[PDB]
RNA sequence: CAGGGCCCAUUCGGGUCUUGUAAUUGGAAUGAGUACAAUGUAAAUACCUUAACGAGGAACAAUUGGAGGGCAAGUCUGGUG
Ligand SMILES: [Mg+2]
Ligand SMILES: [Mg+2]
Ligand SMILES: [Mg+2]
Ligand SMILES: [Mg+2]
């Protein structure tokens with residue numbers, strides 16, 4: 001029983017994807033352990049089944065980005081409570097590092113034609 | 121919209137999953153080109169964005185082993 | 200802080216560690232003079248600029264310009280470390296003149 | 311760490327009273343000063359308190375300087391069931 | 403136009419470490435054998451076998467173009483469909 | 499000015515011009531004015547005005 | 560010389576790229592109006608300046 | 620919502636006189652298109668003219684190549700290694 005969408009073009013295809021996401025998602029609001037195992041794992045593999053070697057590899061790659069981003073957000077959350085730098089704070093013995101703002105100065109390293117006349 | 125299905129149990133979800141596998145898959149047979157574009161991949165991202173970190177690796181690993189056997193399959197087919 | 204709240208706690212820390220009697224040790228704050236003519240201040244200002252996210256030459260030209268404007272005879276800052284590559288490299292940023300040897304360096308160079 | 315309830319209340323009540331605690335990084339010293347409990351207890355318990363944003367530390371030649379925060383005065387107060395604004399560090 | 407004979411893995415010149423993914427093609431009007439470089443990323447997966455490809459020069463007026471030793475032509479269309487349309491998934495191939 | 503020219507509300511003599519690069523000849527400068535067969539030169543309002551008047555006369559009756 | 564090679568690796572990175580979907584934007588105007596907004600961003604509203612005008616500043 | 624001297628000689632107050640952003644709202648305007656009619660034409664089609672319809676943000680949605688240098692345009696963010 002799926003007669004709702006017989007769309008034949010990408011732009012038309014877009015409406016289906018949105019609606020299915022609207023359909024599928026809210027099922028996670030209830031029964032989350034039931035959601036993740038019974039349905040998410042096996043529908044993904046079944047919809048991955050059609051696609052070719054390259055396409056599945058993109059899907060794995062897309063998922064990994066999801067993993068990385070999620071861990072990043074969680075890492076914001078844990079180190080929200082802890083007042084200073086890394087977990088365990090001053091007990092830790094390990095400090096929080098920073099990033100060098102190079103600008104564009106040192107890539108494929110050379111001498112700098114554009115010297116700065118004045119400093120703010 | 122989505123008027124047919126409710127959350128009771130793992131067993132009934134397998135019904136819903138199987139129904140969904142019936143519904144979605146013929147869109148690959150009419151336009152395979154759109155199938156590898158917006159429809160299939162971005163849905164898989166969309167259904168995995170509300171999940172648990174270990175589960176998405178379980179999602180990845182199944183795909184990983186799935187592709188692996190196919191790589192064998194085509195190799196046999198060519199040879 | 201409010202009514203010395205941080206410096207109150209800093210007094211409390213030094214009494215417990217150094218086993219002083221409560222009341223025998225007191226802490227005062229003091230404005231530093233001549234801030235460009237202070238190597239420990241200028242290095243620490245430089246250190247925060249790179250951690251806050253300033254561009255590295257901007258800071259290093261900025262701090263050497265500030266010290267020479269503050270009336271120093273010569274300033275000199277060195278940055279050594281890996282910039283964009285595994286092979287590390289030292290930058291030198293100078294202005295004015297400085298002496299290197301003798302008893303005069305002890306009295307006039309702050310490092 | 312598994313330490314009896316009475317000395318964790320010693321460590322927590324002493325911390326409230328002084329606003330600060332200093333602790334030499336000597337495990338097996340087995341006797342803290344200013345407190346009649348093991349030195350390992352006061353280090354480890356304050357390690358548990360710093361890892362929930364209630365106290366901040368500084369090492370500074372093996373001494374572990376602890377000063378508790380604004381989170382620290384509200385949490386501890388809930389913990390000791392003492393009257394409001396009964397923290398010495400907070401009020402001059 | 404020509405007919406693809408085989409697929410080659412010509413390695414680039416120094417210093418450049420790559421495999422350049424060309425094809426051998428027999429020209430339809432001459433019967434002459436010719437090496438043609440299949441341009442983009444992944445586009446050798448369209449140019450499989452016995453195909454009608456259309457070929458152009460690279461622009462160097464008969465000279466070999468880059469680090470690629472000894473090819474003078476590039477592939478433009480395969481089986482009547484252009485390679486960038488296949489690469490950008492605007493179109494897709496016939497079966498054969 | 500560009501859209502007024504292009505949408506035919508302009509007439510350099512008594513003749514409509516809808517070309518923006520027209521290069522007027524300096525005795526034609528006195529005669530650039532709105533077209534007679536247009537709104538802004540009058541005698542019938544236009545599509546969206548007549549629609550809105552149709553809705554307000556519909557609500558009156 | 561080495562005319563053989565590893566043809567199995569073709570399309571490696573293009574398959575490994577994560578699919579990031581395009582955000583949907585408001586339409587840009589076309590024609591004379593687009594030149595109008597380019598003129599406005601370049602000449603009257605020169606809000607972003609570093610003493611030298613740049614068109615696509617990275618976040619400084 | 621981001622700006623100048625000045626009316627003020629009423630300290631960080633309206634800001635006239637403008638310049639541009641707005642998950643703020645309003646009417647006007649018109650063809651692309653469709654179509655009576657007439658004109659057009661050997662007869663038509665189309666142009667020119669013209670009733671009736673035809674707009675406004677998921678609508679009537681401009682592409683093609685590029686952003687180290689030559690040579691306009693990144694002090695970006697992920698991926699590969
Ligand atoms: Mg060295
Ligand atoms: Mg060379
Ligand atoms: Mg483009
Ligand atoms: Mg490119």
Ligand SMILES: [Mg+2]
Nearest residue numbers: 685686693695
């Ligand atoms: Mg790019």
Ligand SMILES: [Mg+2]
Nearest residue numbers: 688690691692
């Ligand atoms: Mg340039």
